[model samples]
Target: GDKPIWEQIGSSFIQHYYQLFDNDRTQLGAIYIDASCLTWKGQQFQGKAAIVEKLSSLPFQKIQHSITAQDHQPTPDSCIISMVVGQLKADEDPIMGFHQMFLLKNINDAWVCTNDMFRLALHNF
Candidate 1:
């Protein structure tokens, strides 16, 4: 079997996304996000930096994701990816659900995510 297009785009996006998180970069690739699109447990985050900051405040030693699905749709020069990310907590239910959508464009022959939105999945409770 071959890798799905969505997974490929998602993998790339997540790589750079996490890099920004790990390195604590204030700016990385023009990330445009809707502040109200999602909330973690209830706190509102206005941008990528704000989201990262919230993540940094967590007492958990690490955050890991188990991606359950990655679906992709592509145009001649752009792609959209939808995914489900499961957040793992040390001694809890192993699966905290979250859904994400990403819009990516091919810029100078490289894929770059232009818009992203996500929300916590409350049904998992």
Candidate 2:
């Protein structure tokens, strides 16, 4: 049976990208970010390494994510993943947010996230 190419690519992208956050550099080389996509809490982060740092600094007693929507456009050697992320943190209400466009590039047959831009949805008070 043959699976869709986009599915395979998407799965690979998720695996590698998640591994970067898992703090395992055995598979991928040292993670480095020349610039961050955005700054949060006055900290600058870029690339996978930066993401790891940010997540680690959180007081994450428990966390969960639900993907409300995901749109993927695959190119010859790259793909774009745009998704709305819903997250639940310990003792806090769920937060719904959307990411503009996340670029994933195939490097030596592996998918790696190149860029990310996201914003949280808020209620006008």
Candidate 3:
């Protein structure tokens, strides 16, 4: 492991996550948990399954994902918390942005997400 766990996995994870969306969204359910929900434009889901369900069914097309910022911190509970700011858009839709957080724990030496939260970016207080 020449790279720190964070350096090794963080960027790649983000890339792979988005790639899944483009290629095979159904596979996303394998990585996320029932409690790992989503929030899009303010609405929220209780599980990643529901989140993916809605996303897979959305009208958007050729969605792209870019990570503008990323941070990772190791927790006392032996979890790695990751925060990402990303932007996505289709052909005519406005460039919607989002801030997503993931709480990851290692199981059998592989990191797995325990919880996840996502919010669409907007100018609102």
Candidate 4:
């Protein structure tokens, strides 16, 4: 895929990413690799195994992800840089959300997250 096509793919990949996250959070290892990393709730998990372990060990047993807005820009390196703002709620729990950027790359025709930089909403009086 080229410029415009890759851009569209990025959107599709992001949508599928969250869908996978919400549905079967366990199988996320497929779309991530040893080069991947996730910054979650201020905790940085480097590599796929660590990231998956952190997510699997999350305090919430069940959760929901709602995407409100998203934007993406293609990088010169042929990767897609994306930022999504959404809400994530733990089932039967009191919590709401900012969001962050994800660096996505097409590896052997597969879209995988290279780096995930996340920031939670911080509000104060």
Candidate 5:
């Protein structure tokens, strides 16, 4: 392992995840399972099917995320903790800030996201 596992595995996973998300988020089923859970803007979703449904049903037709930063931490149980800071534009809307976190676990030699959370970085003034 030339680089740390966090950078090696986690970096690749980040790139792959966003690629599918920007292209067709519906195709992101490979990284989740029945026990997966997601909290998107405070809306809770569990199970692979439900998560995929919610993602595919997003209101926007087009979105492109520009990642500003990402950090990966390796947990004691060998899971990966990933946090991303970014901005995205949906369709014709102005770009907005967003932050997301993922808890990645390995099962059957494949990395799967067990927990995920997403939020738009908006502040109430």
Candidate 6:
């Protein structure tokens, strides 16, 4: 395939990630480590356990995400930085656009998220 290696890896990871998140985000435990962190809507949660708990406690019985665009770049540190622009709906709530970024590093031959950031695309101008 002519696709860039970073895109290939990032896209594959994103596909599996969202699928698992929509199905059972609690199962995302394997993609993070003790030093991982997540910044959700401006609030930062450090450590894998804390981050997982925050995601698991989301006040939604059902949620779905639709990706509109994405980009991936390889860093000099040998990490992949992936950015996703999308929309999400929770329960019966209206769809809202969002942005998410992931800093992925290969540890022990497996790519894992070292840093994660998510934000709602809500700007009143």
TM-score of every candidate relative to the true structure: 0.52, 0.59, 0.78, 0.88, 0.95, 0.96
Question: In terms of TM-score, how similar is model 1 to the real structure?
Answer: 0.52
> Which tens-of-lDDT digit does each residue in 1-117 have in candidate 6?
689989999999899889988999999888999999999999999999998999999999998999999999999999999999999988988789999999999999999999999
- lDDT digits (tens) for residues 42-101 of candidate 2: 455666566656656666454444455556666665564534354333336555453434
lDDT of 1: 0.57
Candidate 6 stretches with Cα past 4 Å from truth are 123-125
Index of the highest-lDDT prediction:
6
For model 5, the stretches where C-alpha displacement exceeds 4 angstroms are 123-125
What 10-residue stretch in candidate 4 is worst by lDDT? 1-10
Tell me the deviation in Å of residue 31 in model 2.
Answer: 8.3
Candidate 5 lDDT for residue 2: 86
Count residue pairs with overlapping backbones in model 5: 0
Q: Which candidate ranks first by TM-score, i.e. highest?
A: 6
Q: Give the runs in model 1 whose Cα sits over 4 Å from its true position.
A: 1-7, 10-61, 90-94, 123-125
Instruction: Show model 4 residue runs off by greater than 4 Å.
Output: 1-3
Clash list (residue pairs), candidate 5: none
- C-alpha root-mean-square deviation, candidate 5: 1.2
Better of 1 and 4 by TM-score: 4
Model 4, 32-74: lDDT tens per residue?
Answer: 8898989887888899999888877877768788888988888
TM-score-based ranking, best first?
6, 5, 4, 3, 2, 1
Task: List where candidate 3 sits over 4 angstroms from the true fold.
Answer: 1-3, 123-125
In the order shown, the candidates' Cα RMSDs to the true structure are 5.1, 4.7, 2.8, 2.3, 1.2, 1.3
The clash numbers for all candidates, in the given order, read 0, 2, 0, 0, 0, 0
Model 2 misplaced regions, further than 4 Å: 1-4, 11-44, 85-90, 98-100
lDDT of 3 by residue, 29-114 (tens): 86776667666556777777687797788776677777899888778887878899978776688888888887777766767676
